[PDB]
């Protein structure tokens, strides 16, 4: 018993990261094979940041302008080119620490896990959602770019996320592994603001089924409710629809404990109409909307990697 | 700029990590050079755990009833001995992946990272504190004892707590990795309880320093206070006593922002007499607890390992 924010081991990670410096600017690379992946902006000086032409900064660049260290080891790049925000250069050695491991763009409301790292090194391990606006709430300062979120199934590391920026309100946005930003974001450093969020609803019920689970269950009511009176509820209080996608999910926590899920979704109901009343639920006072289904079956029934 | 409850790296950890089984009971074990350490009752029947007599259990024990699992190779067990709570399986080979590492025994209020793990295998890592009344808030299942928590210093794994058992109410208790439990608790399925818990002041404090740091300001008031009168005032709200010790402890945080720890003391005073009008700090609507002065420095300055 017990639920916590929890986040993949981050071991097969941390043996992937490098330092990737040129010029004088220095960031985080992910050394997969004999390839390594960084944030393009590694090319620019602070000057460049605003504007940046980056198929023209890399023109004038060469294989040696990239300095990469792998721990005291420095690596040798043999190539190099530019894959959207993505930089990959071919270096002369595998990385013998490489796990199996894909590439996977997530969807809004999923979750992962990040390391976050400085100079190539690891500082700290953290769990994300990708928010509905294609945020995340992350940790992050300068130097931070780079770092990578990711999942785990068994022994394959699901790369997720790259780092790249910070917006003016505390909040983080990158790129998945080909480059591609998620949300209507650019790599410069011009005006850019996220849209405004949005509660992930299914993860909330996904949590309030861990809270059954552990034993925390005063929220429960007596009632039920139809998908649409619900989502009509939601909809006031600034959180997603609920789709038959979402139910379909919340089908084995709704097995495990024998609630169905409109009925879950009855309690939920209530406590958006009415708070909570100084009560916490799993010892929070808001609720929580950063652990999917998957997730707490995971945390719940003890799964390995 | 964000602020998350951060692990370490858990990569270190990681490479030590094996299966212990006795018998039918699996536990996990830490393998750091030639010795394996694990929870003593892997020896235990479940018949036994109401009243073990571990030495008893243990002198009928062979090297060759102990299976240690790294991955898919078996070590050798080459001799076994018992130090207060812990088992320690010397075995023929050394691990290879060894950190550099120590033992430590921690205080209440101290934080640490647990990896959760299963039949030698890691589930997730998170972030704990060792309570004043010596719980964690963990999250635990059957079969994770001999998983550990650690803090991590440059290079340096400080190996500070064992798994063994969770009490009644969702909570976790453990020895440290010489056996010594912490707290007036013992290895046996027999009705235990901690003592009732208090909130760990100079970590509050902590955390509203990285609130400042993050822009998060709205509680600071105009006001000090004496470390006396707020003392007064923690103590019916069930705040532990703020020495001088932990005054000093704040110092680098006071330093860099420039509030002077009464201050802050005096703004704490008035959010507790207050509360805090359904606002928020760093996201959360209660007063957080579980971040050192430390790992407030150590997350807003980006320190590597
Ligand atoms: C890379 N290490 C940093 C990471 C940032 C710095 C503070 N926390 C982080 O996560 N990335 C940057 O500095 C990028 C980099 C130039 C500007 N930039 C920003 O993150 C800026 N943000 C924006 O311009 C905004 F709002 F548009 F997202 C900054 C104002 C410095 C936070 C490039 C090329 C975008
Ligand atoms: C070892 N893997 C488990 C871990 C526990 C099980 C559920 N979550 C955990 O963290 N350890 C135990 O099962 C230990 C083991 C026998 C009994 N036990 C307990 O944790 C029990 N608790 C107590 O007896 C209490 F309250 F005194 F702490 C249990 C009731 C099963 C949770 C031994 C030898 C103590």
Same mark, same amino acid.
């Given at each position: 018993?017990?639920?916590?924010?929890?986040?993949?081991?981050?071991?097969?990670?941390?043996?992937? =990261?490098?330092?990737?410096?040129?010029? !004088?600017?220095?960031?985080? %690379?992910?050394? #997969?094979?004999?390839?390594? &992946?960084? /944030?393009?902006?590694?090319?620019?000086?602070?000057?460049?940041?605003?504007?940046?032409?980056?198929?023209?900064?890399?023109?004038?660049?060469?294989?040696?302008?990239?300095?990469?260290?792998?721990?005291?080891?420095?690596?040798?790049?043999?190539?190099?080119?530019?894959?959207?925000?993505?930089?990959?250069?071919?270096?002369?050695?595998?990385?013998?620490?490489?796990?199996?491991?894909?590439?996977?763009?997530?969807?809004?409301?999923?979750?992962?896990?990040?390391?976050?790292?400085?100079?190539?090194?690891?500082?700290?391990?953290?769990?994300?959602?990708?928010?509905?606006?294609?945020?995340?709430?992350?940790?992050?300062?300068?130097?931070?770019?780079?770092?990578?979120?990711?999942?785990?199934?068994?022994?394959?590391?699901?790369?997720?996320? =790259?780092?790249?920026?910070?917006?003016? !309100?505390?909040?983080?946005? %990158?790129?998945? #592994?080909?480059?591609?930003? &998620?949300? /209507?974001?650019?790599?410069?450093?011009?005006?850019?603001?996220?849209?405004?969020?949005?509660?992930?609803?299914?993860?909330?019920?996904?949590?309030?089924?861990?809270?059954?689970?552990?034993?925390?269950?005063?929220?429960?009511?007596?009632?039920?409710?139809?998908?649409?009176?619900?989502?009509?509820?939601?909809?006031?209080?600034?959180?997603?629809?609920?789709?038959?996608?979402?139910?379909?999910?919340?089908?084995?926590?709704?097995?495990?404990?024998?609630?169905?899920?409109?009925?879950?979704?009855?309690?939920?109901?209530?406590?958006?109409?009415?708070?909570?009343?100084?009560?916490?639920?799993?010892?929070?006072?808001?609720?929580?909307?950063?652990?999917?289904?998957?997730?707490?079956?995971?945390?719940?029934?003890?799964?390995?990697?």
């Amino acid at each position: 018993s017990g639920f916590r924010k929890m986040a993949f081991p981050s071991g097969k990670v941390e043996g992937c =990261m490098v330092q990737v410096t040129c010029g !004088t600017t220095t960031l985080n %690379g992910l050394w #997969l094979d004999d390839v390594v &992946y960084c /944030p393009r902006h590694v090319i620019c000086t602070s000057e460049d940041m605003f504007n940046p032409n980056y198929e023209d900064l890399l023109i004038r660049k060469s294989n040696h302008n990239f300095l990469v260290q792998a721990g005291n080891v420095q690596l040798r790049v043999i190539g190099h080119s530019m894959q959207n925000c993505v930089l990959k250069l071919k270096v002369d050695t595998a990385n013998p620490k490489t796990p199996k491991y894909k590439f996977v763009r997530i969807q809004p409301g999923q979750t992962f896990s990040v390391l976050a790292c400085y100079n190539g090194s690891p500082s700290g391990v953290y769990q994300c959602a990708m928010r509905p606006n294609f945020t995340i709430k992350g940790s992050f300062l300068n130097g931070s770019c780079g770092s990578v979120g990711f999942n785990i199934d068994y022994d394959c590391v699901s790369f997720c996320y =790259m780092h790249h920026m910070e917006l003016p !309100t505390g909040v983080h946005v %990158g790129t998945d #592994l080909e480059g591609n930003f &998620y949300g /209507p974001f650019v790599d410069r450093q011009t005006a850019q603001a996220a849209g405004t969020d949005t509660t992930i609803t299914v993860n909330v019920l996904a949590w309030l089924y861990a809270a059954v689970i552990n034993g925390d269950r005063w929220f429960l009511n007596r009632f039920t409710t139809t998908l649409n009176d619900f989502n009509l509820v939601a909809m006031k209080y600034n959180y997603e629809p609920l789709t038959q996608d979402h139910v379909d999910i919340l089908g084995p926590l709704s097995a495990q404990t024998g609630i169905a899920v409109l009925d879950m979704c009855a309690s939920l109901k209530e406590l958006l109409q009415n708070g909570m009343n100084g009560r916490t639920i799993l010892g929070s006072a808001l609720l929580e909307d950063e652990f999917t289904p998957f997730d707490v079956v995971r945390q719940c029934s003890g799964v390995t990697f």
